[PDB]
Amino acid sequence: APADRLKALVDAAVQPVMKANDIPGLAVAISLKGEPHYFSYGLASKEDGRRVTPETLFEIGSVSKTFTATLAGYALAQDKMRLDDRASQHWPALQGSRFDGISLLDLATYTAGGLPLQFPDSVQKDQAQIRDYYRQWQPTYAPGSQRLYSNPSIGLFGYLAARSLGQPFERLMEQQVFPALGLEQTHLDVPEAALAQYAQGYGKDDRPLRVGPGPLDAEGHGVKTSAADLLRFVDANLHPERLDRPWAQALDATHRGYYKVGDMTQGLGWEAYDWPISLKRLQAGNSTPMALQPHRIARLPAPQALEGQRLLNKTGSTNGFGAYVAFVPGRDLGLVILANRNYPNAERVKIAYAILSGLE
Ligand SMILES: *[B]([O])([O])[C]([C]N1[C]=C(C([O])=O)N=N1)[N]C(=O)[C]C1=[C][C]=[C]S1
C-alpha cells in the first residue's frame, strides 16, 4: 500500500537521525501532489511526557526570515518600498549614517558590508540601543560585494519594510500576514491559551531552553508554529496564484534570486539549488562555513526566477530547536521537519534528502 511505503520511507529517514542526535521530538509534514501527510515522533516535553503531534508548536528560528521576506514582498507589491531604496529613506534616525549607502536588497541578502551574525551582546532588545547600533555601524567592505549571513542585516530589512507600511512589524505579521496566509497556529508571541501545545526545547547541554528576548528577534528568528501550519505556508509558496493577488505577488517576490555563492542562489529569505543535486552539495550549501564566513557573491545580471527544477530551502534554529523547510516548485513537493533540539543542519538535510529522493 502507498501509505505503508510512505511511512516506511519517512521512518527510515527520521528514526536513525533522532537516535544519533538525541532528538526528543520531531514532526514531519509532507505536501505531495496536493495532499498533506503527517508523521510525528517522540516527545514535545520529556518532563511531562506530552507527545509531538502535527499541532505541536516549535520554535523555527531563522525559518522566520521567509515570513519576514513575505511581509517585505507585500510592501514591494503595495509600492511602499523598492529593493534599490537606500535604508535611510525608511528611517530618519539612519540619515547621515552609513545606511545612506546601503540598499534594502543589501540588507535582505546579507551584503550590506559585514553586519555580523548576531547583534553584539552589548545591544539589548531596546529601541534606542538598536537605533544607536545602526547609526554607528561602518562596513568592513563595500556594500553589495560579500555575503555574511546576518540577523541584524535581514532584521533591519524587516523593520524597514514594516516602517514603509506605517505599522510595527509584529502587528503587521499578526493582523495582516498570518491571516492572509490562513495561519491560525503561527505566532510571534504564543498566547497563554496555546501554551499546552508549545514544545520544550533541549540545549546542547540537554538543559531546557525556549528563546529569550533579543533585538529584532521577531524579524530574524521569532516565529513559533506547528508542522501543519508551516506546511500550509509551504503550500502557499508552491501555489501563490491561490491567494488574493497582493499576497500572491508577495510570495512571488520571495522566489527571485539575486546572486550565487557556490551551488546556492540567494532570494529574499529562501535559498535555492538546482534539483537534482547531490546530498553532499545540499549539505555544503547549508554548512557552518556558509553561515559564518564572508563569501564573494556572483551577482546575476537580472533576478532569476526560483522555480522549476529547483529546491528552495531554509534552516532555522534557536538554543533548543532545529527546523528545516524545503520545496520543489516544479514537482508540487514540500517538506517540513521541526525538532526540539538544535541538531546539525547537515542531519536535517540528510532526513529531507532521503524523503524527497523517495517521493521522486
Ligand atoms: B538562524 O536560525 O539562522 C539564526 C542563527 N543561528 C545560530 C545558530 C546556532 O548557533 O546553531 N543556528 N542558527 N538563529 C538565531 O539567531 C536564534 C538563536 C540561535 C541559537 C540561540 S538563539
Q: How far apart are CA 346 and CA 51, in angstroms?
A: 25
- The gap from C-alpha 9 to its chain's centroid, in whole angstroms, comes to 26
Per-residue cell: 328: 520543489
Which residue minimizes the CA distance to atom 9 of ligand 1? 317
From residue 342, alpha-carbon distances to 27, 60, 200, 201, 204 in Å are 14, 10, 12, 8, 7
Which residue minimizes the CA distance to atom 22 of ligand 1? 318
Overall size of the chain counted in residues? 360
Q: How far apart are CA 38 and CA 334, in angstroms?
A: 12
Do residues 202 and 52 make contact, with C-beta atoms less than 8 angstroms apart?
no
Can 149 be counted among the known catalytic residues?
A: yes
From residue 191, alpha-carbon distances to 16, 26, 65, 188 in Å are 34, 22, 21, 9
Q: Is the CB–ligand 1 distance for residue 319 below 6 Å?
A: yes
Q: 116 alpha carbon to ligand 1 midpoint, in Å?
A: 12
For residue 308, how many other CB atoms are within 10 A of its CB? 11
Q: How far apart are CA 227 and CA 335, in angstroms?
A: 9
Decide: helix, strand or coil at residue 287: coil
135 closest CA partner among 65, 88, 205, 203 = 88
Q: How far apart are CA 162 and CA 184, in angstroms?
A: 21
Q: What does 311-348 look like in DSSP terms, one character per residue?
A: EEEEEEEETTEEEEEEEEGGGTEEEEEEESB---HHHH
Atom of ligand 1 nearest to the CA of 214: 22
Decide: helix, strand or coil at residue 162: helix
Q: How far apart are CA 7 and CA 9, in angstroms?
A: 5
224 closest CA partner among 270, 191, 247, 193 = 191
Which residue minimizes the CA distance to atom 8 of ligand 1? 317
Among residues 40, 62, 153, 226, which one is catalytic? 62
Per-residue cell: 156: 533591519
Residue 330: is it exposed, middle or buried by C-beta count within 10 angstroms (0-12/13-18/19+)?
exposed
Contacts of 5 (CB under 8 A, 6+ apart): none
Atom of ligand 1 nearest to the CA of 118: 16
Q: 1 alpha carbon to ligand 1 midpoint, in Å?
A: 40
Percent helix / strand / coil, the chain, rounded to 5: 40, 20, 35
Can 287 be counted among the known catalytic residues?
A: no
Q: 353 alpha carbon to ligand 1 midpoint, in Å?
A: 22
Q: Is the CB–ligand 1 distance for residue 64 below 6 Å?
A: no
Q: How far apart are CA 119 and CA 121, in angstroms?
A: 6
Out of 60, 62, 63, 319, mutate this one to test ligand 1's pocket (max ligand atoms within 8 Å of CB): namely 62
Method used to obtain the model: X-ray
Q: 318 alpha carbon to ligand 1 midpoint, in Å?
A: 5
Q: Is the CB–ligand 1 distance for residue 200 below 6 Å?
A: no
- Give me the sign of the Cα torsion angle 218, 59, 22, 354: negative
Single-letter residue type at 262? G
Please give the helix or strand (H or E) that residue 274 lies within, else none: strand 271-274
Contacts of 217 (CB under 8 A, 6+ apart): 125, 211
* Dihedral class, residue 341 (left if φ above 0, else alpha if ψ from -120 to 50, else beta): beta
Q: Sheet of 256-261: strands edge to edge?
A: 35-42, 25-32, 333-339, 321-328, 310-318, 271-274, 264-266, 256-261, 298-305
Do residues 118 and 211 make contact, with C-beta atoms less than 8 angstroms apart?
no
Q: How far apart are CA 239 and CA 86, in angstroms?
A: 32
Q: Is the CB–ligand 1 distance for residue 150 below 6 Å?
A: no
276: preceding bond cis by omega (within 30 degrees): yes
2: preceding bond cis by omega (within 30 degrees): no
For residue 147, how many other CB atoms are within 10 A of its CB? 20
